[PDB]
A paper describes a structure:
Inositol pyrophosphates (PP-InsPs) are eukaryotic nutrient messengers. The N-terminal kinase domain of diphosphoinositol pentakisphosphate kinase (PPIP5K) generates the messenger 1,5-InsP8, the C-terminal phosphatase domain catalyzes PP-InsP breakdown. The balance between kinase and phosphatase activities regulates 1,5-InsP8 levels. ScVip1PD is a phytase-like inositol 1-pyrophosphate histidine phosphatase with two conserved catalytic motifs.
Crystallization of ScVip1PD Δ848-918 yielded a second crystal form diffracting at 3.4 Å resolution. The two apo structures of ScVip1PD revealed a conserved histidine acid phosphatase core with two insertion domains. In ScVip1PD Δ848-918 crystals, two molecules in the asymmetric unit also adopt the “open” conformation. Crystal packing interactions between two adjacent GAF domains in our ScVip1PD Δ848-918 crystals are mediated in part by a second Zn2+ binding site. The Zn2+ ion is coordinated along a pseudo two-fold axis involving residues His573 and Glu575 from the GAF domain. Given that ScVip1PD behaves as a monomer in solution and that the histidine and glutamate residues are not conserved among other PPIP5Ks, the second Zn2+ coordination site is likely a crystallization artifact. Similarly, deletion of the large disordered loop in the α-helical insertion domain (ScVip1PD Δ848-918) moderately activates the engineered enzyme in vitro.
Residue numbers in the entry: 538 to 701, 709 to 913, 915 to 962, 973 to 1025
The structure:
């Protein structure tokens, strides 16, 4: 009895955001500022090659910490051609308005990975199969939206190709708005106390019963992190690191691997200083490495041999992955609101325009004689739109805490049949990243959709929603 579909889709796999920062006083580094006495940003690929050349000059004639110029230079050579890669030069002025030192900040990442096109194409083909079995006329009524971010449009483009300018960027609905950033900071400060001292798993807050107090979990993660840093150092100092993995996608090499983890090891070596914003960073890198650098991850963290044969050795690492998922399940989802009122206000400030559009599109599909509208959005809108759904009081089949992580290519579906059925998918998500069978593509298949509600009267679902718009 199908009549239409309004599907919200998250962007596909992306690389972790990474940056190197160092300050230099040598003249060759100061000359990169080209006389300017304020922050200088470099994003022209040709300008990056010139800066790259400056690092090679510094190398031949010692100008700065040689070890640190190599890591910046090596990272830049591999990353100079990636959109979003930039250099920031922050000059430091002394009492006489003279630049005495310049901070060199190299930032890169946040681009869709080589795996994203595969994930998006499978979904577009799957949806073509699904549609050509429900009603072939639906393909003639496809409308596609995308945020302005490159990673989001990238996902939208390959899904559209797989499904069949038609993609209509809509900044007001699907791009980020500073309306909720004022309120998410009020919330962010509220999460720090939840993790420290001895808060007894405050209220429900998405936390397992068998787990000890949040502060104990953090302290154990620090122990596992301090443990693996020493393994990594021991492996770099003794073994050949360049032979620990035969495939390096995205132009990465063992040096960039060490940098991502060296930073995290620095940020997770004192439990009384762990920042809750950095839990998501730790967990984002663990998925990335488990997806794209498993072999090197195995070997560079391989302890060796402890007497007995085949004695399991990746015990401390599996524990670390498990504990990071707990922290990611009870901090990051609560950046969009802790209390129901916070989840509500942040949810409206972020996704109210999109929510009004969806109900109207469902209303049009009822009056037309089926169609589909796909909105490709950043990760933030999926949580917030979901929060609006729950706080509306509409009868659910599953509680919020029970939903799986809203991973890459997570979807929210509004199926119109008169009756509305809500379904969701966690996207390309796995419960055992260290055991999943991977291809050379470093690509995980997508999880089928699950029903959030049953068939609910259309006229009913509009009152509960329009009552929350006050
Ligand atoms: Zn200037
Ligand atoms: Zn890869």
């Amino acid at each position: 009895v199908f009549k239409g579909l309004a599907i919200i889709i998250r962007h596909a796999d992306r690389t972790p955001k990474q940056k190197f920062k160092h300050s230099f006083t040598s003249p060759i580094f100061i000359s990169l500022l080209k006389g300017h006495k304020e922050e200088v940003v470099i994003r022209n690929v040709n300008d990056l090659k010139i800066v790259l050349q400056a690092l090679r000059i510094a190398l031949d004639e010692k100008a700065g910490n040689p070890a640190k110029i190599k890591v910046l230079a090596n990272a830049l050579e591999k990353k100079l051609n990636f959109p979003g890669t930039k250099i920031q030069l922050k000059p430091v002025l002394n009492k006489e308005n003279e630049v005495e030192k310049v901070q060199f900040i190299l930032k890169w990442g946040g681009e869709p990975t080589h795996s994203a096109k595969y994930q998006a194409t499978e979904l577009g083909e799957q949806m073509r199969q699904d549609f050509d079995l429900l009603n072939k006329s639906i393909l003639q009524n496809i409308k596609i939206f995308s945020s302005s971010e490159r990673r989001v449009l990238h996902t939208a483009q390959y899904w559209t190709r797989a499904l069949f300018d038609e993609i209509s960027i809509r900044k007001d609905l699907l791009d980020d708005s500073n309306a909720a950033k004022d309120l998410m900071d009020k919330v962010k400060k509220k999460l720090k106390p939840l993790l420290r001292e001895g808060k007894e798993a405050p209220p429900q807050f998405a936390w397992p019963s068998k787990m000890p107090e949040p502060y104990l979990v953090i302290k154990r993660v620090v122990e596992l992190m301090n443990y693996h840093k020493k393994i990594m150092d021991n492996n770099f100092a003794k073994k050949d690191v360049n032979s620990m993995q035969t495939r390096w996608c995205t132009s990465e090499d063992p040096s960039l691997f060490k940098e991502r983890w060296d930073k995290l090891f620095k940020e997770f070596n004192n439990a009384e200083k762990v920042d809750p914003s950095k839990i998501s960073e730790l967990y984002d890198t663990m998925k990335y490495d488990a997806l794209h650098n498993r072999q090197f991850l195995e070997n560079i963290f391989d302890p060796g041999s402890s007497g007995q044969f085949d004695e399991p050795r990746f015990m401390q690492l599996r524990e670390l992955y498990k504990l990071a998922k707990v922290l990611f399940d009870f901090i990051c989802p609560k950046e969009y609101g802790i209390s129901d009122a916070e989840k509500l206000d942040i949810g409206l400030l972020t996704s109210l325009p999109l929510a009004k559009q969806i109900l109207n599109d469902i209303g049009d599909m009822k009056n037309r004689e089926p169609a589909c509208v796909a909105y490709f959005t950043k990760e933030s809108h999926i949580y917030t739109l979901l929060n609006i759904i729950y706080e509306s009081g509409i009868p659910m089949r599953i509680a919020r805490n029970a939903l799986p992580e809203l991973d890459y290519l997570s979807q929210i579906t509004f199926e119109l049949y008169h009756s509305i059925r809500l379904k969701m998918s966690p996207g390309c998500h796995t419960q055992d990243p260290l055991d999943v069978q991977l291809d050379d593509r470093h690509y995980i298949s997508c999880i089928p959709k699950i029903s959030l509600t049953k068939h609910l009267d259309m006229d009913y679902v509009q009152q509960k929603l329009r009552n929350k718009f006050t």
